[PDB]
Design a protein around this ligand. Structure first.
Ligand code: NAD
Lengths: 495, 495, 495, 495
């Protein structure tokens, strides 16, 4: 087990690749332009990263298209694609320490989280998806004797994947797993706030046996190369994870261009409903704190609204405060740290402004509330709780994407459901109760893509993940994720 | 069997409903405005139809939402929804003669087609979908012993369905069958060129037991009430059948509003590939003619590009010409008629302009090419064939939506495939060959949602139907149609 | 609603068919022999029924085989088979009053049960199965590009169905629905204790459009014609519902003959577990009584072992006694009657012998325990309860097939599960508890084909039904029932 | 690449384990008795192998049952069972040279086949099955609002697997893959003619992480320990691969004991149908020879009946003779050898007696026909062809299980199908034709579990494998194999 000093030495000794990757080779952007990749750990310069634009999108898509048409990957035997995807996952694990360190330096999450959650999670999405390839069957319809009706799935062709900065490698892998497994070529566009691991795994893909052109990586800004990919007339599908605002703009881009398929994973304001008859209130308290403090609250499914049955509120809230007190910001390179830096100054100022809005709209600060560790040259905020929140308050309605918890009360299950569903979002929700009927009926009534019962942040690769309403469309993970990267064909044969 | 005189008597004796339908009652538009519904068979006034706008969209959506929330239909037992949908289908059949007559008068297709194809096809979509409801199973994941992982589907809520004029009732039913079967409320917006059957079946739905508010019908223009539904902030999903141009606009509307799900069935320029080793050339010739002449060529999957192997071209083209000669425009109310009127003057001018374009771009007219029966006051054009067509010509690239055939030649299977896929569209295609390998390998290479082998216009309710590329996204018919009207939920329960 | 006098008039006015049915015609047995069909309601002669033997089995199998080979039904379009099966179900309903009367007279169940449960249940099995036919899809494997791998299902051919007397029509339909829907020819052998409804519906099948030879019916004894079918070298599959003893004998017959597939639905000793935290004790008490008294306890899944948590036992047992008191034997032709006659004298003696065994082995009689209504000439026994039962006692280990309840106690969930699973059987079980974890974990631990939670006798046509262990193999109802009547084929095509 | 001399040295240097394996340890049989394991390569003594009997079956099943009930494997997380199964497969590959050598020495197949087909094939069944575990989903029925209907699968408990000698390790793995993956305990009973690899992999299972008691191995005779397992009252399921005669006896044993589930893979007499319009006659000739000579014709799906369209017979048969001449018996330890020894003297004498019967019944010997290489001390027979065979001849009806081909002619497709289906068997069949319709219609009409088109011996792990009629019931490989090792449960929960 590596120490803080070990990680600090390794961080200093990294040579960091900043180039784009197109047709099997690292490359500068056509313009030669770069942007500074700055670490939120302490503000050090990590790398000058290629700043791609429309011209680079064009070259990457031409490369993607040529590779798809060659059939080198798209017509490779399923069992062979499986083997390659599993080797790809294996190379992530083999290079786990470097990749984890890049993630931590790039966007500030604790090294123990990068190493323990992100890298294994990314690898698992690649290998599980790979494992599934030849376990999938298409269909033969019930037809008259002189007909053979086949209903099959084929890869769409060229896929653009635009991903965010909060789980850079893992979110990339949630897309790459099913998209590559089904045989598509993918152009990956990582967040400008976290380009490094995406850039690095482009090389690993080649080493695993992914052909040149099949996985191209274009670092750069959303409003330049991201937009260019979404408007491209020869991209078949764009998959996206990010804000609801940008997600909507992608639907507009598709409409303005070639009617490409658009699949979105967007914001959340997930309600964590704790009933008086929860089987384990301490577990509910620990989980409620973890739900908002894990990864600095920079989680789409953060349990940012805590709904507590009023009769246990006075006992439960102090339990949640004490649990939250164990989540402490610190040096992300220290293995003992469980809360890291926020991704940058821009994000931190947004979070601080929402904390200010909590005060303004009349909520009661009961824990945290301040920026800390300023002397480090990094960006850190205390996990924060507001009590006495009404669901119409800004901190109840709007996604904060920091470790800021809103606490609301209710007195009936029906009110809990009404409050929980009172949102434009619908990514996740949780219910804590020992009652059989109340558990299933409440879960059934919540309009959310994931509903966790007597736990938070549940599910694994077998569980589809995605939004109701403005939290998105379509699902990541599970076999259902494959459907975003394929087209149905009905082949009706007269005999 | 009814005679022409019988159908003319019946046409005269219809009382035709023109009002919108909201919350279980026929109603004027809020503005009181109407538009004239004129028959293309000769020009008579059928009815003054309510011209709905945004205010009516709002009232209909409020009705739909309230109905959905009440659970009267959305939480009705699956077996009971099945019985209702089957009764709904049964009422279409019970009233087939009236509905077919309305269809024929409304948009000009032959009465024998309305009676023999449209009404049975529509009824079948409703009954088959109903039958399927309790044959569908959701999923239980493989999880650790202390977890129960449920993956289920739930109705999205409020669905707007916007449909075209070429198969008014049948297309409405393709949407209504699965949308209603899954438990949604639906707001149906029929084409302003063909509002009458949708208006009529609103009452039949009530009679079958569909609760008030669950199926609302808003006749009116695309740019008024259609647009209002697509921009509405409380519509969860819009499903669409129509032009690629408008389909794209709907993606923009969704992005501008509430990120509603958008499912599109759009245009086509389907290739009909006849190899020299086709098993039955006469069958191929008969189907090639039917593929362009049926429903006046106003068919999304019309075989508008006939690709013929050069070595049989001289023999096959005269066969296609002779077969096309049996398709003759005539009085739509005559049961002997197999080709009806074009939907309106605007449509006839478009077809005539494309025939002119055929000449201009250098193709050779070998059949038809002219308006006929002007004395009737109706709009009729001869089924038309151009030979010597290059795929770059306008008549080869652009959807005409009239009975105009382009004939192209090829020398190799590779060439046929390249030409076939050389289109922004991808709705359907056909292959004619007696060879096992060539049939399957060519079918596999064609980028289209339906591929018919040794037949044209194949499939039934078991066959998903929809586009690759700019022909749309998602599928109508089959069980896959249901997925457009539901959301996946992952319920992970800690035990 | 018909009165007792009405049903008695109708009983007198029946003309009852007693012949076998082969190749579209009613027929005597080859030997000319008959057996007396006597009613347990009072002892009248209903009909002299053909007593078939091996010669008749041979002729029926030859008819079945020829019909199968002709394709009249086996290669009939799926949608047409669906329509026929639905018409078949519709004829059962059209003739419900006659069929229910035949059932009640034949084996003694109350007329209100025959009319309200048996005939609708049978019709439902036929129509639901029919509806499902064209909703089923076979499979296409993930293969290399030069391979097409089809995995399809085909009817086995000739199916023998051997059924019992407790639900004569409904059990026959549980087999016929999926066996006929998949395209097989079926030879049905009803119990010699209840031949009449099977004989009758043979004609209804013809009327619905089932071709001659596809459904043959051979009334007669198990050891003659039943055995002949099970040993027949040209029967592909036998499906069976009856005793575990005979079920085992069928496996031996298959091994002695042609290795035909054997699917068994056999005996049961189902445990009904009521925890102290059951949500509704009165509902639990009412269901516990119904579970043993319904259809005279002549139910494979009768809740014959009531397991009660010791801490509610003193409160719950009087509730069960009072609820059982509402179940009173009476004239089966009286519509007010909720408990009918036992099927014959042999059955009554068996029940009385087990009541004697209850006393001998040391249990405590707390309700019923005696034959009643001897003056009627019929066979009736009081619903009976023994308290203080140990699971090692004969009444706890052996299936009684009468209305005799054994009451056992437990202190822990672990104990309840151990007792519940302490049986050679495994057909059904029930759990009553308001606790989420306990309900799912206990249901998971129970080795039984059906587990009902907070209800008894649950499920519908969507729920597969069948045994663990010596309660049988394979499942009736649901789509899984179809798999007993088809064979998988892997067609791997090199392209 | 190892030479013949290398393999001869390795064979001499093996230390061979002969003991049974129970509860994590090698053990003598209770009696202390052994049988001589003799090599058909040259007659050398390989090992004295434990000769288990009823007492050993009892101890193994008690061990299996205790392990299943402990949940160490049966309740282990799916993802963890997957990982263990993949490591298990990995250890087969890691020890491939030893395992391949054991197989070759034990039952005589060429070392290049053992190394290239058997070991990789066995490993692949284990890992593919393992990979599938968490890709499988169970079901949630469509039910009323106050019901939750779960349809799930659970392991049956204790599985007996009885396997033959022709593919000892691979057939064992076809059973072990799905049986262990679903969580069962397995008692494996290898053929007394080939016990060695089964004995050896028992240790590898433990090293991979399979808990003690979960995989027990009992070498010994069929009529002692095999029979004891099939009659055991606490074995839930027996799966079998072997002769039809013994397969039938297992059905009888189940009936005599506890009604255990019985799944059989039995004999074959597979027809290889070559039409005049086969796309590649040379390929058909090569494959027809391989179909009968591979693994000494000791293959269940050996293409033992060659049906050739009469018009190509005179040209085709010499092609088949020339191809068959490339398959030459030789030293199984020589890597160049492509035909090995027959398993023993008993088998060889059976084969020679069938060759004698070919002469007697009037067939024409056109190739091979004699025992060879007698001086080696081993058992070898020339690949043999009889022409002018009629389907009623013994060599056409009966399974020979040696390299003996029967050649038949036909003149119509209909006759080809009649002849092909004229058998009590139905394991596999093949069709060679370039015609689309004839390929699919003929394949559809053949009553066989596998149908190969324009190839022989096709399919991989995605293709279910097993018999129609007396070739067995149920399927090995694919996801369908899992169903033999699990039970369906319907859990209906009232809410
Ligand atoms: N599974 C999920 O649903 C999921 C997971 C993690 C994070 N998120 C969401 O991500 C957001 C935080 O991430 P973010 O700040 O990177 O979001 P963002 O919307 O600002 O950007 C996401 C990605 O889109 C790109 N982008 C920005 N503008 C673009 C444009 N005009 N056209 C094309 N691409 C453009 C960015 O460069 C980045 O790669 C939150 O709203 C959070 O809820 C969702």
């Amino acid at each position: 087990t590596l120490t803080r000093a070990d990680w600090e030495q390794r961080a200093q000794n990294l040579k960091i690749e900043g180039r784009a990757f197109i047709q099997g080779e690292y490359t500068a952007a056509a313009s030669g332009e770069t942007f500074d990749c700055i670490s939120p750990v302490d503000g050090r310069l990590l790398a000058k990263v290629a700043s791609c634009d429309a011209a680079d999108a064009q070259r990457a898509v031409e490369s993607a298209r040529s590779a798809f048409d060659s059939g080198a990957w798209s017509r490779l035997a399923p069992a062979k694609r499986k083997a390659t995807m599993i080797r790809f996952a294996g190379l992530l694990e083999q290079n786990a320490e470097e990749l984890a360190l890049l993630e931590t330096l790039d966007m500030g999450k604790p090294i123990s989280d990068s190493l323990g959650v992100d890298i294994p999670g990314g690898a698992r999405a690649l290998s599980w998806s790979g494992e599934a390839i030849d376990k999938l069957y298409d269909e033969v319809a019930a037809t008259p004797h002189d007909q053979l009706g086949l209903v099959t799935r084929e890869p769409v062709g060229v896929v653009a994947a635009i991903v965010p900065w909060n789980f850079p490698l893992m979110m990339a892998c949630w897309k790459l797993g099913p998209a590559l497994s089904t045989g598509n070529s993918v152009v990956l566009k990582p967040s400008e706030k976290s380009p490094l691991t995406a850039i690095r795994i482009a090389q690993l893909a080649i080493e695993a046996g992914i052909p040149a052109g099949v996985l191209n990586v274009l670092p750069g800004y959303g409003h330049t190369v991201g937009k260019a990919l979404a408007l491209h007339m020869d991209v078949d599908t764009v998959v996206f994870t990010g804000s609801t605002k940008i997600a909507k703009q992608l639907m507009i881009y598709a409409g303005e261009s070639n009617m490409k398929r658009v699949w979105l994973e967007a914001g959340g304001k997930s309600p964590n409903i704790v009933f008086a008859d929860a089987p384990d209130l301490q577990a509910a308290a620990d989980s409620a704190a973890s739900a908002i403090a894990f990864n600095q609250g920079e989680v789409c499914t953060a349990g940012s609204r805590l709904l507590v049955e009023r009769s246990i509120k006075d006992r439960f809230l102090p339990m949640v405060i004490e649990a939250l007190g164990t989540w402490k910001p610190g040096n992300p390179l220290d293995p003992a740290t469980n809360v890291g830096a926020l991704v940058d100054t821009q994000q931190m100022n947004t979070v601080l402004s929402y904390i200010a809005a909590g005060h303004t709209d009349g909520a009661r600060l009961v824990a945290g509330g301040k920026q800390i560790l300023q002397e480090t040259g990094g960006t850190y905020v205390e996990p924060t709780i507001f009590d006495g929140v009404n669901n119409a308050m800004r901190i109840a309605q709007e996604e904060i994407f920091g470790p800021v918890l809103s606490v609301l009360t209710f007195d009936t299950a029906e009110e809990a459901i009404q409050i929980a569903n009172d949102t434009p979002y619908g990514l996740a929700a949780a219910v804590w109760t020992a009652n059989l009927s109340k558990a299933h009926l409440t879960a059934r009534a919540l309009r959310a893509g994931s509903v966790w019962v007597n736990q938070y942040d549940g599910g694994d690769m077998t569980a589809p993940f995605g939004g109701f309403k403005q939290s998105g469309n379509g699902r990541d993970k599970s076999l259902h994720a494959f459907d975003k990267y394929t087209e149905l064909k009905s082949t009706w044969i007269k005999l």
